[PDB]
Amino acid sequence: IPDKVFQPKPEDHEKYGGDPQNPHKLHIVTRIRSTKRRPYWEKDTIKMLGLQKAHSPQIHKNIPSVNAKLKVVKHLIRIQPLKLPQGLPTEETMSSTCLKSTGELVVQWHLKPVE
Amino acid sequence: TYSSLPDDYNCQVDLALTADGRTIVCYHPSVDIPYEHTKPIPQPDETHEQILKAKLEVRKSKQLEQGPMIEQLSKVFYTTKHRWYPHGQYHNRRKKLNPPRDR
Amino acid sequence: YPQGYVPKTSLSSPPWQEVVLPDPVEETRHHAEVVKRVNELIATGQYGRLFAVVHFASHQWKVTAEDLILIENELDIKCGERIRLEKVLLVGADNFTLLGKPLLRKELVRVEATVIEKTESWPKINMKFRKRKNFRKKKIIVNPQTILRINTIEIAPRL
Amino acid sequence: QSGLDVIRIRKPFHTDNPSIQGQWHPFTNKRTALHGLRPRELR
Amino acid sequence: SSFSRAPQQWATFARMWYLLDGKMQPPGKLAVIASNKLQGLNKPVYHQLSDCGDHVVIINTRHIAFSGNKWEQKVYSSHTGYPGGFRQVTAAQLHRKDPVAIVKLAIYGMLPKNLHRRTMMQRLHLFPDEDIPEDILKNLVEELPQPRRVPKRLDEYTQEEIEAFPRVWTP
RNA sequence: GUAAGUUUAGAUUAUAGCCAAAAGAGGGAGCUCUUCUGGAACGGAAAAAACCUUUAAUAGUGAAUAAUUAACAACA
């Protein structure tokens, strides 16, 4: 596959809402398919990545080695950029953290409807 | 005419969000049929048991044979003759003596 | 006929018919008027039997006076002790009902029930399919159980 | 445990007043006619 | 509410009689509706073992309309069970022999392939013409709107409609 | 990214598939072979060892989803 596939365009950035500068640090990956009937190399990568259970949240760094590994298993995973509206959680708030489906990890859970 | 469904058959439906907006309140007072839209009791001045006996009339050869009797029974209830036929002792004994009944 | 005029026909208009919703300002007045009557109804206690829908464990239980509910698990609560269910989404009255979004406020509705018995489940047979099944490859399931009796359902005019 | 027999329970819920607003019957939601005229009645 | 147990059971489990008009109506669309009414699927508490089917009365079956050329293209096949007992008849021929046969066959095929189908057919009443026994009318509870809206003919069109309709071109 | 690996000593058992799908070679149909890849539902493709969706198995009168036999005459 040509490298142009992984070279983004200005329109692509708008569609996916990703800024070319300050790229997202952490990837959110969940397995949505089975590795049965797949070649051994595909099976090995999934086990190494820890995505044994489907729909299992995993925190991984957006680094070339992880990026290379994720590309191999791209079709079996969903990639979402992590967002920290309130910043990194503190030690005291480590028990109050909650990750939303939108990709935002709130450090304080107030048990109030967003509405 | 705020209600989106007709209120004339079952009950008047009054839909209203609460002031806080946390609750949806439905008020459903029942509606009675108008007097003008009802029929009077039969003015002319017989028990259903008598009618049932009359329907299964005994006319030919005094009591009719089993087949005609089943056919007469089948016609009244719009059922098949197969339903009326009895069953053997084996299954009859198997029937539960004390079936449970709730509500 | 004016420019770009299309008379209504079978294919000019969709099978469905467009409707116009009522204006909001007057509609909001209708909302308050119904609420005011309802608050008086709750205050006047013009209701008898009530039914409430309560979500417990992974199940939703419609509840009424004298109802008996069986929970297929232990609760750790002694028998004869009254307990309050905290998750109620709907409560019904003779001529009116309240619907949570998705739950009502705790102040409006309070529901209490009592634990009657702690029990287990009658044996359940489990047998996996395999060649040469044999008769001794059998397992029984006697998972725990508990019994609850509904005691009271309470509402107040706190609209 | 209670003396109650331990066998399969068909329904986990027991209520003596299942209905509050009335049980549905065919005449429910059926619109009436003036004078209670039955269908096809010329009158 | 507040009714006695037995009367409440009687009313809820009671069977209703329905009237259907087949004039210029496709039997297939009617059959689908008829199956719903006959089987008792029109009730909110429908159950497979509750025998909640309802009586259906169909009239004007002689005047039914078939879309396309189904009159000449649809062939019904039956076998007597003896050698050479294979019979194939077109829809038009079947209607000529019996106006009600086509409607009954379609309903029977649409109905579930179970023992209850035979009982349901007993509850079904098919009349070639508008004539009905009076007692059936007393039994009849409601009539159902025709599934298909009948288009109007040129003569049926009102004079006012003709004036409203514009002349697209001038001859 | 991840947790096994090398050496020393003792010791056997297994060493015959099936079908699908790729790459070749005989060939010209199709076959006949050699090489690589995958499979063994309780779901689906009609019934369907071999194809598709499917990480194990537990009770519950809950919930969101995957594959999923159907599809909509011609002339400038």
Curated annotation (Swiss-Prot), chain A:
GO terms for cellular component: mitochondrial inner membrane; mitochondrial large ribosomal subunit; mitochondrial ribosome; mitochondrion. Residues 4-24 are annotated as: Disordered. One of its GO terms (biological process) is mitochondrial translation. Keywords: Mitochondrion, Ribonucleoprotein, Ribosomal protein, Transit peptide. Its main location: mitochondrion. GO terms for molecular function: structural constituent of ribosome. It comes from the Eukaryota. It is found in: Mitochondrion. Belongs to the universal ribosomal protein uL30 family. Component of the mitochondrial ribosome large subunit (39S) which comprises a 16S rRNA and about 50 distinct proteins. This is Large ribosomal subunit protein uL30m. It comes from Mus musculus (Mouse). The lineage of its organism: Eukaryota, Metazoa, Chordata, Craniata, Vertebrata. The chain holds residues 41 to 155 of 160 of the full protein.
Swiss-Prot record, chain B:
The keyword Magnesium does not apply. Component of the mitochondrial ribosome large subunit (39S) which comprises a 16S rRNA and about 50 distinct proteins. Component of the mitochondrial ribosome small subunit (28S) which comprises a 12S rRNA and about 30 distinct proteins. The keyword Magnesium does not apply. This is Large ribosomal subunit protein mL42. Belongs to the mitochondrion-specific ribosomal protein mL42 family. Keywords: Mitochondrion, Ribonucleoprotein, Ribosomal protein, Transit peptide. GO terms for cellular component: mitochondrial inner membrane; mitochondrial large ribosomal subunit; mitochondrial small ribosomal subunit; mitochondrion; plasma membrane. The lineage of its organism: Eukaryota, Metazoa, Chordata, Craniata, Vertebrata. It is found in: Mitochondrion. One of its GO terms (biological process) is mitochondrial translation. Disulfide bonds: none annotated. It comes from the Eukaryota.
UniProtKB/Swiss-Prot annotation, chain C:
It comes from Mus musculus (Mouse). GO terms for molecular function: RNA binding; structural constituent of ribosome. It comes from the Eukaryota. GO terms for cellular component: mitochondrial inner membrane; mitochondrial large ribosomal subunit; mitochondrion. It is found in: Mitochondrion. Component of the mitochondrial ribosome large subunit (39S) which comprises a 16S rRNA and about 50 distinct proteins. The gene is Mrpl21. Belongs to the bacterial ribosomal protein bL21 family. Keywords: Mitochondrion, Ribonucleoprotein, Ribosomal protein, Transit peptide. This is Large ribosomal subunit protein bL21m. One of its GO terms (biological process) is mitochondrial translation.
UniProtKB/Swiss-Prot annotation, chain E:
GO terms for molecular function: structural constituent of ribosome. The keyword Mitochondrion applies. It is found in: Mitochondrion. The keyword Ribonucleoprotein applies. One of its GO terms (biological process) is mitochondrial translation. Coiled coil: none annotated. The modification N-acetylserine is found at S1. Keywords: Acetylation, Mitochondrion, Ribonucleoprotein, Ribosomal protein. InterPro entries: Ribosomal_uL13, Ribosomal_uL13_bac-type, Ribosomal_uL13_CS, Ribosomal_uL13_sf. One of its GO terms (cellular component) is mitochondrion. CDD domains: Ribosomal_L13. Belongs to the universal ribosomal protein uL13 family. Component of the mitochondrial ribosome large subunit (39S) which comprises a 16S rRNA and about 50 distinct proteins. Interacts with OXA1L. This is Large ribosomal subunit protein uL13m. It comes from Mus musculus (Mouse).
